[PDB]
Description:
The first copy, chain A, is mainly beta. Chain A has one helix spanning 87-93, and strands at 2-3, 10-15, 18-24, 32-33, 43-49, 52-66, 69-77, 84-85, 96-98.
Amino acid sequence: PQFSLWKRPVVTAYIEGQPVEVLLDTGADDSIVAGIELGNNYSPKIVGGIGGFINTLEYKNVEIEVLNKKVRATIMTGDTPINIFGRNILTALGMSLNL
Amino acid sequence: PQFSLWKRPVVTAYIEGQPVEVLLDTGADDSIVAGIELGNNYSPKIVGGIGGFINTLEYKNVEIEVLNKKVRATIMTGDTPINIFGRNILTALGMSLNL
Lengths: 99, 99
């Protein structure tokens, strides 16, 4: 598909079967998701953006289906105002920015 | 041109004759640059991020040259770790995210 950017590039994904609305984000190195519990095999992390820093919990090899594709990808959970799939996932979908 | 996203999508833009490196950012509504001075025709803005909010100064109709094109866009100035071109600049340019 094509996202033309007049509006935000927002889709629904399934993360281990749970439906989440996520923002496709070329400006995020990582993917961060608020309000889902991925269990106990995590490593605590710090990520920055505009406005400071967050403590996240890093989960490896999590199962996602989005845009009718299926990937296993690293997901961080933390207190974010918007769930973002960053370049770790965009690349695995084979997505590019074109002009 | 095509951006693969294996590395952050970072280009040199000129904003009123001045060279800067900017991340092309699909998850940013607006465009924020640190270390420009654009003057006194400004309106103060609040812009939400992942970490918190920043106060910025917004300027309308700024002349920008990037990727061998020239555009007039709204640019906000402030304390951002990295310089962002958001969707207001990507759609002016005609860029899309493709799958």
